[PDB]
Amino acid sequence: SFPEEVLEHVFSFIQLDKDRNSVSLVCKSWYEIERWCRRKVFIGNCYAVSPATVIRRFPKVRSVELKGKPHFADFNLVPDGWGGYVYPWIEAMSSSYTWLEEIRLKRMVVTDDCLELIAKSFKNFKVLVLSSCEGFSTDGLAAIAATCRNLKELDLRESDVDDVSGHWLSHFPDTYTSLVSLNISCLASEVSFSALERLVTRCPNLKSLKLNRAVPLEKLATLLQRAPQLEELGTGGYTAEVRPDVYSGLSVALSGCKELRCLSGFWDAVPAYLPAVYSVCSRLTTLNLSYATVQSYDLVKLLCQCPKLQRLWVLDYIEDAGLEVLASTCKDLRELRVFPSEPFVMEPNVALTEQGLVSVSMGCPKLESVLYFCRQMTNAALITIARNRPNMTRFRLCIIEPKAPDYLTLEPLDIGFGAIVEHCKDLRRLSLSGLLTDKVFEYIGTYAKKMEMLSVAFAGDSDLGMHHVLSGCDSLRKLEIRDCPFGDKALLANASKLETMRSLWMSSCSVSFGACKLLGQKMPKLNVEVIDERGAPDSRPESCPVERVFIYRTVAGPRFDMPGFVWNMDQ
């Protein structure tokens, strides 16, 4: 029996999406009060709902987050033109959300028209995050720079930009001072260094500056002198002739940066200049050495200086020896990602094996997130990892050769991964690889009750495997599968499960056109999309497997923007 204004005020302290959703369901009164004051909307699948529906329901939104293409798009498994256009969302928001402040997009197609419309529609615009987006150029960036007088964040994380000219950055006016975060690390084109230096100088609240490779190491100290308050730094190029003056200038500048907690960049890092960063390392919590091609011993020297490290991304050049030192020194490590230096060569180029991961699992008590690329694995290693780290929440293990068995026993890795799902009760994400039979999927279905996202490739024997997962994985939200003998039977037998999930991706599997049509008939609230570049699917027998199928629940119905190689199985 609270006045409307009182309930509006209670709700202002409730900002989690799930809480807001639950509030909207208590009664009709709360539905209407909640919707008029919801500040942020998170749309994990842009096709699960229409812009018009969001804008009508939530008229006062100031922050929108939208995700487009599925994750396997990252590996070239989604053909160009599939979809994910943000323009319809911007067009719709442009007339309704006059007060919009934040747009965060992931795997969407964003054009210069989209960026021009944002700049001219949203006067209070403050945050633009484009993560793995494509479709725009520096001309669109120039429109944002010129017009968005209140801009605080421009983050282009792993996007593909048409690099027409670095001059866009010169369009930030002299009166513009509000920048807090700038990430231009994906841009090929060199910006005007004088423009950049003037920008950094006049932006006192700048806390995160992630440069592109085109800012050479010899110019880095100059920028750092202008921004000693930085909390995150992404270097530009990290190579120069080896000289005492350059080194000492870089050393002095970096040691003047007392608040740095996150360091990245390091393109073409030369071991000679890495010590400049040591003074910073005592307090670092994130270190991204993914692009540094330096050898194990050089990495060890740096990591020895990093006792507070919480997140490390490194190349397999670290080696087993380097990871043993890591396990000794970084007792607060929460996340480790070890990427392949030569992912496309079969013979190992580094001494990085299963032992490195065992070493860290034993030595790092808070380690709960791993992505690890290696060339060999054993069940014994996986069992020791599982037993050492029952607190693991995300475990992603890529053995580079498809279907590689345990190298010591030649057995499938079923029991190794079965130990992970058995022992790590709060595991929310799993990707597994190596030789795997239906038995591993039986373990997953029995034990992995909190798993939300599963990625599978070249695995299993029959439809039983997918059936165990769909039948047993209570928390499953996203399942993505490639090159597995799974098909019609498991999919149709578990069709209602699909309404409980964001999406299911299956490519190069055994799913027939016939089963896709039937699934589409049966489940009209699913969009069942066959994505196949061989032309019309009924030019082939109904029994013929489709190249890919992507299935997702939606309240919007079939898509209006499918290309010629996508068909929806509804009527």
Binding site: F72, D74, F75, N76, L77, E158, F339, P340, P343, F344, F373, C398, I400, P402, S455, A457, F458, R482, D483
Partner: peptide, 13 residues
């Protein structure tokens, strides 16, 4: 090779 395997963003060699 296999398309999109290993699952990395790296340009091929």
């Amino acid at each position: 090779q296999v398309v999109g395997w290993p699952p990395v963003r790296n340009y091929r060699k």
